Structure 1
Amino acid sequence: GTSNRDWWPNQLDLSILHRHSSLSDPMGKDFNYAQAFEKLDLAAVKRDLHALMTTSQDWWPADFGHYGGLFIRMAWHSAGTYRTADGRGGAGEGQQRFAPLNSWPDNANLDKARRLLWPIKQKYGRAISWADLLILTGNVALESMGFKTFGFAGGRADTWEPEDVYWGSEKIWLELSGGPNSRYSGDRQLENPLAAVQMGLIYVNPEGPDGNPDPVAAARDIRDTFARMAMNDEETVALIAGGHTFGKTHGAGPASNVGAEPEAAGIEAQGLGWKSAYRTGKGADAITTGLEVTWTTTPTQWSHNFFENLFGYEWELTKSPAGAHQWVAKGADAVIPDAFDPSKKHRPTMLTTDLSLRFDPAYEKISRRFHENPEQFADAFARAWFKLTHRDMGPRARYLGPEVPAEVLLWQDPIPAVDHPLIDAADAAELKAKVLASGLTVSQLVSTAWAAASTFRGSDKRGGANGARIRLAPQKDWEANQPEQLAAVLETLEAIRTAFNGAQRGGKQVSLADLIVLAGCAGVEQAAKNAGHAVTVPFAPGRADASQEQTDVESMAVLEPVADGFRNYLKGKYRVPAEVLLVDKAQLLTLSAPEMTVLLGGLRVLGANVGQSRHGVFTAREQALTNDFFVNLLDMGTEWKPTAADADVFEGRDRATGELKWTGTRVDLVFGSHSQLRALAEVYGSADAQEKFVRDFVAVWNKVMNLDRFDLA
């Protein structure tokens, strides 16, 4: 059946804004996962998980009699799709159970692992999500095998359909670099927002870059991909060596024995895949990646054997039974146990990427420190495992249950506790009047609050206006934020704040974070008044101000908007059309198509454009909250053409006279071009819609101002 995507493959896809509707969700519309989880008997779940570890099923027998290694890998793949670039991927939505990730080649046989958890999921029902279960099982596996974890938070709500993520443009699974859709260019530069080296891999190729077994070049890829998942050198060595303290790989025979991945298998396979014709197809005959490596002399117990073996032997290049490159210890005795046959033992083996930990010079120093000080290694790995499994969860207010660590970590972008009475409605009125009396304009007030709040992304729940981090490095210097104008607005706001706070009793005070947001609300109210409408914009206090020492400047850099269509901003020229970038940003902000439409039309007229650009400012009453953007955009009395100087700027001219009426970008004009967007614009550009526009604008404005308000959730 031919589809619109077939006929017009480069037209914008708005269905990504309408996912995760109440239609696809089986739970009622008021189902609150947090409340279900809070009543879960978590200790009972953990006892069941401990039992499962050694309860081998005949359809996928447990290596060494213990599924721990398989479940740790399962949990690390669950978390390991995360990209700091957009916040997308990670464990936080349980997306491993859906396409495509359920069938990625790197997730081979993790279908079996998830199926082993069905009876526990079934027993506890809606009170523990799959997303939470996958991570808890990884924690229990570690604990079962003698490693004490740093803690665990629940609260990852399950999702019910595939997340829309750009994973790459290759049309062949695992395609090597330099093809027609290469994710690499130049000096091995991986394209943003990707965080893996080949389509269908978590991070890197275990044989080495594009299959070439050089540990030093492999180290480069490990470092690049791990940095793109938010992990530095210490955390990376701790994670890889910690993980490979346990379990084994599977490559007992040739890969051509292995059949269709789950999404391609027959209906009789009942959701499972990679069925293998090699001998029994499982256990001692398992084939998962094709590598055949067992790292330690006690694969089911925490030990310090990974680094003893790494440093204690010299390594020779060899091949697994499936033909994959891997390394064997020169001259070693057969000291590694077999996973099924008590009378067999094996020499120590390593992956190319394991040897990176020794042969990359920066990794070697950390590996050596961990080898000499195994207590440091233990603590680093525990902390890293917590980070890995919680990095996409959001602020600490979302963390549920009795195992949440009390230590506050820099990567969590922590927000101080509020310790004082908050402002009330009479105080908010007084502060709004002070803000309007100072001379700050509608444009300044709206632009600053937008700049503060629109850093939020729902993908990893980072960003937003809580914290007042717009006043700190690096946000205060971002070009999209207009540093000189920002400084002057913040200075005026801080004077108002200081005066209000100095006048209070009883410890009451207002944060700068709250005041920025409140000042934006005063500007929207003033804009409505300018248009002859009486509007009150809702405001919820309770934001606190974070310090510079609580704000990791390099981790903050991914939140920098390089494209923000809501302010008609593009930092440079990109291969992706700007309207595709707008929809991407709308998705991160959790906006539907109607919300994105209303919001953008209103911001244009309020003067939220960066640099005071006139592009899309289709009104003769700037700083008044009207639907002018829509009524003018849709006026057939105007004809639009790309400019000579710039194909991405358009001039709109009177059809009868040729006189210039307006200019716009692709972000402005897409609302008059895309047939679903123009349908939405027509609603707001109708003669009966001025009041609807104002009230829908105030709603969406308020929504954006509260995106990060998990303390009120």
Structure 2
Amino acid sequence: SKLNLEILDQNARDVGPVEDYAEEFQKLDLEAVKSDLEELMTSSQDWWPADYGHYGPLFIRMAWHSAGTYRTADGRGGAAGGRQRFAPINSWPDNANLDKARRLLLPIKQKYGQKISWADLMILAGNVAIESMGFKTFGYAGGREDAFEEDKAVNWGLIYVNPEGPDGNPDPEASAKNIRQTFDRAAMNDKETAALIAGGHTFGKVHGADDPEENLGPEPEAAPIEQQGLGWQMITSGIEGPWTQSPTEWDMGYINNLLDYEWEPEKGPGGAWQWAPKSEELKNSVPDAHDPDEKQTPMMLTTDIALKRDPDYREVMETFQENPMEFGMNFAKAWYKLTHRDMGPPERFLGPEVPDEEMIWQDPLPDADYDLIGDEEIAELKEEILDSDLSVSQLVKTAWASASTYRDSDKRGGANGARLRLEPQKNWEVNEPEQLETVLGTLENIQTEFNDSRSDGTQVSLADLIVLGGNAAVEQAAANAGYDVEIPFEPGRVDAGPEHTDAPSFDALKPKVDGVRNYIQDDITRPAEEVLVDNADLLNLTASELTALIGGMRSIGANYQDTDLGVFTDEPETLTNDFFVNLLDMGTEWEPAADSEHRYKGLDRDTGEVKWEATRIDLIFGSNDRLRAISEVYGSADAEKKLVHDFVDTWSKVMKLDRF
């Protein structure tokens, strides 16, 4: 049970041989990569013969699996850093043979080098595969910075479900429920699901030419060195056969065979259950994928049937079949979201194939119909935010609630936009609704008064003012300790309306733990310090920064319900290193509080009286070894100025996490 500190470690450097990609990509002749991709598609390599002489259907699987592992909970997984290339995901059994898929794209990758990431490439192969099979995508954009290693944070072997039926049972009624929930926790809803599953299986076949548990070598990570990174030494799933009769053209095909004919539960030529027709008019309808003098009968899966059996999915399909323009429209649109969902907002969609239309899931931001504030206005605004009935605590705490939502996995959240004042942020437990309203109130009136007073068209947003009071507040506390710090500040944030906000999607940013505010929700099954570190990672913090941050915060005192937990000082709202001096002091001894979920009491070792209250968040800086080593530097007689500066650089950094 030791803190997986390594994940924070990741944020102190970047591994790999690179000292911005956006700039490089901006130089790439996209059209030519799409060209060479077209080519590649019918350009069969002997070491892994192409099905029907078209690689596209495969490449679709390589794109779909690259993005399919996304999760809204943490914005992790997905295809943003091209992490399909690395263990353990690269050896998921659901990703069998997809080593070859990525290998075909190596010449290309090699030709363009730094101008296209594996990341942007894999999704482009997906696009091109499709475009040149009768369809046409709703758009494409690059911008996916290539990662150089696994995601050490993820707590994960399948993209969604078992294709045989849950637990390996051909019970389609039942598999649906598994489909229904994966896709939910994926963000797709009933209609987006069937579009993608059907859009998807209108192409290619399955591969179960013989049983895998006996015909397939180690998966990439256990394979012998000589296999140069490939593995599973034609078989992938264990299930054999195509869906459509035209496995390489966009069309009703799947929705046709699925809905017109009836299907029986059979055992395939690789052991796993599949389905075939009781109907005999599809028998040898499809050309063999390889032998040109050969025919093959279509198959379906439990997973496919479950579309046709679930009350709801079934109707989505009837619609689609009774109307194919809608089939396309939905599937065009779902594909684009499935593949781009985790790249953040418009500012980060690059290239000349980005739609002109902006998607709700980009959590887009309006424009500044005014001239930005200048330094003269800045000091002016900063004086007046301190002159208000608002304390340090209050401003800090607000400035944190506005910025703390930024997560780096999907680039969602942040202070810019000021979505804190909106649903569902203005009404989060941890945000203290009635308290939050006050602060918002008070700052709105500064905007009001600031703007009205201008005879030059300059304006300030609330989103700026939230952060600005925050910086101001933090400067005040540092002046209350004898230091003279000026934080760097960036005007330009804007205020987003509800209309351009998908409120229910923002629920996934709800912190079940918040270290700066010593907030710990009742439920939590993980230990607090675990989720602390995990979040610490969404903000891209190193152990050291997480350490100064929380430590300096406790000197200032900005807690949920204004409690005194970890507030090991008797001069709150003064910025010092008292947290560490007192946490490190052996004069004081710690013990759990009885009849209390999160609380501990710090007693005088002698007297045996109460001296401090705290929680695991505060105490962890004193228990785990590495964190302590950091605490000990900060506690030291001369660490104080250093902790202030370190606090400042930290806070100021988080303030700006989403200034993409």
Say whether residues 1:163 and 2:111 are aligned partners: no
User: Is the contact made by 1:653 and 1:662 (CA closer than 8 Å) also made in structure 2?
Assistant: yes
Alpha-carbon distance, 1:398 to partner: 1.1
C-alpha distance in 1, partners of 2:198/2:554? Answer: 52
- Find out whether 1:268 has 2:226 as its counterpart: yes
Please list, as runs of the form range in 1=range in 2, the aligned pairs for 1:20-31 lying within 5 A after superposition. 21-22=12-13, 24-28=15-19
Residue 545 (structure 1) shift: 1.1
Q: What does residue range 521-540 of structure 1 map to in structure 2 within 5 Å?
A: 521-540=471-490
1:34-81 CA distances to partner (integer Å, 9 max, x unpaired)? 111111111111111111001111110000000001100000000011
Identify unmatched segments of 5+ residues in structure 2: none
Of 585, 591, 594, 1:635 maps to 585
Equivalent residue, structure 1, for 2:267: 319
Q: Deviations over 1:304-333 (max 9, x none)?
A: 111111110111111210111111122133
Q: Tell me which residue corresponds to 2:8.
A: 17
Alpha-carbon distance, 1:474 to partner = 0.5
Specify the alignment match of 1:278 in structure 2. Answer: none
**DSSP 3-state at the match of 1:556:** helix
The corresponding residue for 2:282 is 333
1:415: how far off? 0.9
Residues 63 and 364 (structure 1), Cα distance of their counterparts in 2 relative to 1, 3 Å cut: same
Matched, 1:49 2:40: no
Matched residue type, 2:638? D
Q: Find the aligned partners of 2:597 and 2:71 in 1 and give their Cα distance.
A: 32
Task: Please list, as runs of the form range in 1=range in 2, the aligned pairs for 1:229-244 lying within 5 A after superposition.
Answer: 229-244=186-201
Q: Aligned partners of 1:218 and 1:135: how far apart in 2?
A: 28
- The one-letter code matched in structure 2 to 1:410 is I
Q: Which residue of 2 aligns with 1:570?
A: 520
Deviation at 1:20, TM superposition (A): 5.6
SS of 1:662 mapped into structure 2: strand
1:668: which partner in 2? 618
Whether the 8 Å contact between 1:606 and 1:624 is mirrored in structure 2 is yes
| In structure 2, C-alpha distance between the alignment counterparts of 1:72 and 1:706, rounded to whole Å | 37
Q: What do the CA deviations read for 1:13-51 (whole angstroms, capped 9, x no partner)? A: 2111111654622012xxx21111111111111111111
1:125 paired residue among 113, 121, 125: 113
Q: Do 1:565 and 1:578's aligned partners in 2 also have CA atoms closer than 8 Å?
A: no
Structure 1 residues without counterparts, runs of 5 or longer: 1-9, 169-199, 276-285
Contact 1:293 1:351 in 2 (8 A): no
Q: Which amino acid counterpart does residue 222 of structure 2 have in structure 1?
A: A
Q: Normalized against structure 2, the TM-score is what?
A: 0.98
Worse overlay, 257-266 or 337-346 = 337-346
Q: Would you say the 8 A contact 2:142–2:351 is kept in 1? A: yes
CA-to-aligned-CA distance 1:603-646 (integer Å, 9 cap, x gap): 22222211112111100011111111111111111111112223
Partner of residue 206, structure 2: 249
Q: Does 2:567 align with 1:617?
A: yes
Cα distance change of structure 1 residues 20 and 486 upon mapping to structure 2, 3 Å threshold: closer
Give the equivalent residue in structure 1 for 2:250.
302
CA contact (8 A) 2:59 2:129 kept: yes
- The one-letter code matched in structure 2 to 1:297 is Q
Equivalent residue pairs, number: 657
Select which of 49, 60, 79 maps to 1:91.
Answer: 79
Secondary structure of 2:74 counterpart: coil
Question: In structure 1, how many angstroms separate the alpha carbons of the residues matched to 2:455 and 2:334?
Answer: 44
Q: Mapping of 1:106-121 within 5 angstroms?
A: 106-121=94-109
Q: String of CA shifts for 1:364-402, please: whole Å, max 9, x gaps.
A: 221111111111111111111110111111111111111
Task: Select the residue among 49, 55, 63 that pairs with 1:67.
Answer: 55
1:195 matched residue in structure 2:
none
1:660-704, CA deviations, whole angstroms, 9 ceiling, x for partnerless residues? 110111111111111100111111111112111111111111111
Q: Please, which moves more after superposition, 16-25 or 49-58?
A: 16-25
- 3-state SS of paired residue (1:548): coil
The aligned residue for residue 471 of structure 1 is 421
1:648 positional shift: 4.0
* Structure 1 CA distance for aligned equivalents of residues 506 and 574 of structure 2: 34
The Cα shift of 1:345 comes to: 2.5
Q: Secondary structure at the match of 1:700?
A: helix
Structure 1 window deviating more from structure 2 (57-66 vs 527-536): it is 527-536
Aligned residues of 2:11 and 2:542 also touching (Cα < 8 A): no
Kept in 2: contact 1:64–1:300 (CA 8 A): yes
Q: State the one-letter code of the partner of 2:31.
A: A
Letter in 1 for 2:591: K
Q: Show the counterpart of 2:554.
A: 604
| Structure 2 residue aligned with 1:185 | none
Please say if residues 155 and 400 of structure 1, whose CA atoms lie closer than 8 Å, have aligned partners that are also in contact. yes
Who is 1:291 aligned against?
239
**Corresponding residue to 2:627 among 659, 674, 677:** 677
Percent of paired sites with the same residue: 63
CA contact (8 A) 1:38 1:400 kept: yes
Q: Secondary structure at the match of 2:627?
A: helix
Q: 1:150-189 counterparts in 2 under 5 A?
A: 150-168=138-156
Whether the 8 Å CA contact 2:10–2:542 is kept in 1: the answer is: no
Within-5 A mapping of 1:388-407? 388-407=338-357
Q: Show CA shifts across 1:197-240 (max 9, x none).
A: xxx10011111111111112111111110111111111111111
Contact 1:20 1:160 in 2 (8 A): no
The code of the aligned residue for 1:265 comes to A
- Superposition RMSD in Å: 1.2
Tell me the distance in 2 between the aligned counterparts of 1:571 and 1:657.
Answer: 33
- Residue 306 of structure 1 aligns with an amino acid whose one-letter code is Y
Residue 412 of structure 1: how far off its partner (Å): 0.9
- For 1:259, which of 213, 217, 226 is the aligned residue? 217
Q: Quote the residue 1:698 is aligned against.
A: 648
The answer for the alignment partner of 1:7 in structure 2 is none
Displacement of 1:337 in angstroms is 2.4
Q: Normalising by structure 1, what TM-score?
A: 0.91
Ranges of 4+ aligned residues in structure 1 off by more than 3 Å: 20-23, 165-168
SS at match of 1:663: strand
| Residue in 2 that maps onto 1:182 | none
Determine if contact 2:82/2:147 at 8 Å carries over to the other structure: yes
Hey, what's the Cα distance between the residues in 2 that align with 1:392 and 1:517? 26
Deviation for aligned residue 1:575: 2.3
Q: Distance in 2 between matches of 1:458 and 1:363?
A: 34
Q: C-alpha separation between the residues in 2 aligned to 1:507 and 1:208?
A: 63
How do 1:313-392 residues align onto structure 2 when only pairs under 5 Å count?
Answer: 313-331=261-279, 332-334=281-283, 335-392=285-342
Please give the alpha-carbon distance, in whole angstroms, between the structure 1 residues aligned to 2:525 and 2:340.
33
**Residues in 1 aligned to 2:11 and 2:204: alpha-carbon distance in whole angstroms:** 37
Inter-CA distance 577–361: structure 2 relative to 1 (3 Å threshold): same
The CA distance in 2 between the partners of 1:348 and 1:53, in whole Å, is 23
Looking at structure 1, the residues matched to 576 and 473 of structure 2 have their Cα atoms a distance apart, in angstroms, of 14
The aligned residue for residue 80 of structure 1 is 68
Q: Counterpart of 1:531 in 2: which secondary structure?
A: coil
CA distance in 2 between partners of 1:517 and 1:233 (Å): 40
Kept in 1: contact 2:12–2:542 (CA 8 A): no
Q: 1:682 and 1:330 mapped to 2: Cα distance? A: 74
Counterpart residue type for residue 233 of structure 1: D
Verify the 8 A CA contact 1:684 1:693 in the aligned structure 2.
yes
Q: Which residue of 1 is the match for residue 159 of structure 2?
A: 202
Q: Which amino acid aligns with 1:211?
A: G
